[PDB]
Amino acid sequence: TIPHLAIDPFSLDFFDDPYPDQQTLRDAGPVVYLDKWNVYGVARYAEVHAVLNDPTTFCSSRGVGLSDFKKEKPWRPPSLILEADPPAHTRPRAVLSKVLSPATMKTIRDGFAAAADAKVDELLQRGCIDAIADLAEAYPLSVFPDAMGLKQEGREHLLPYAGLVFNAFGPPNELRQTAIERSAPHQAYVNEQCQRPNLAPGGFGACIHAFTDTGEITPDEAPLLVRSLLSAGLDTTVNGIGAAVYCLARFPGELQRLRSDPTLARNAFEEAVRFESPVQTFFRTTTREVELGGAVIGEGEKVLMFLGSANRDPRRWSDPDLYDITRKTSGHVGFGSGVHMCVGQLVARLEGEVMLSALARKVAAIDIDGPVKRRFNNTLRGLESLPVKLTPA
């Protein structure tokens, strides 16, 4: 009943151009079996959305990577939020929700926007830049570690730790095993910065620790929740802003629309999250036998969701393969959906908005003027290098 496919969604060929293989996955049926890794796959919007929105049947506490925590030892202590189910999930979720709240956004917005304008002005002096190292990486690196309250020393470890995290959701291929081999110093740095004494007053980290007396979390939970923000909050935004710039460079008509109405900046970023989905895939584990898209999946089975594919499903989206900054994007699953829907989305959107705003006001053209290089990762999609020429408005 369920079709069996030999496509490896964690192969370099697949990362290099996933879209044909994703259509193959979608069109094979609502539920496929991937023989390469012995997991179920869902690549259509309807099923991805369904799975995300049934956390009881499709749980996160057995890991959202290939590895099933009931069978194997997690490579690091489980995340208290990503890798928990309700009810254990609920109160740590509420804390991060309050730390990364509207009111917090209001306190950091002017500083994030100043840094974005400053960076763009700086890049315009150089003219010819690498939009990944010099922009997509540089800008979040200039605001997010400070917003966390991290010391200056050791920040070089943040992006490698994050790449390690996203590679570790994948299967035990060479990307994963190589990241884990080199992980020790990145883990040591991160875990040490998660302790209260190391997090500057006023920051997200110190705020998490200050929530440890409300009865929502205990002091011994706070360092792992800081760990969550250091895992999830930098590299994703780097790839999201990277996606946006790449899109504006490939769709000059849309840069021109953005320039003419900079208030389109927030939706232009959202549409880039749909179009390139920085977080491409991750898993759930079935807690019982279940019927999904007319197919029967047994208990204790891993289910691979293709978020990027869901976001390009022509069953859901008109002209899914176009970047349209005035698209009604609501419903996209680039930030997930349901109880685990990205708790950091206000931070991401704020970074993305104020950067695209800066570009909209200061830049007349973005032309690729060098070889584009992709960065390969088991679950993150994004570029290694994007040489562009920026023309000042």
Ligand code: HEM
């Ligand atoms: C464009 C940028 C981002 C993207 C595409 C993204 C994507 C996602 C997705 C797809 C999920 C759902 C995972 C699941 O359902 O298992 C998620 C959850 C989460 N994200 Fe984000 N994220 C981004 C930015 C951020 C930022 C900036 C932070 C922190 C400041 C953050 C922290 C988290 C955390 C802690 C979770 C776990 C939430 C939960 O399990 O309730 N993310 N993210």
Ligand SMILES: CCSc1ccc(C(=O)O)cc1
């Ligand atoms: C899979 C969505 S991105 C993400 C990575 C790490 C964590 C965490 O460490 O809790 C949360 C979300």
Ligand SMILES: [Cl-]
């Ligand atoms: Cl760790």
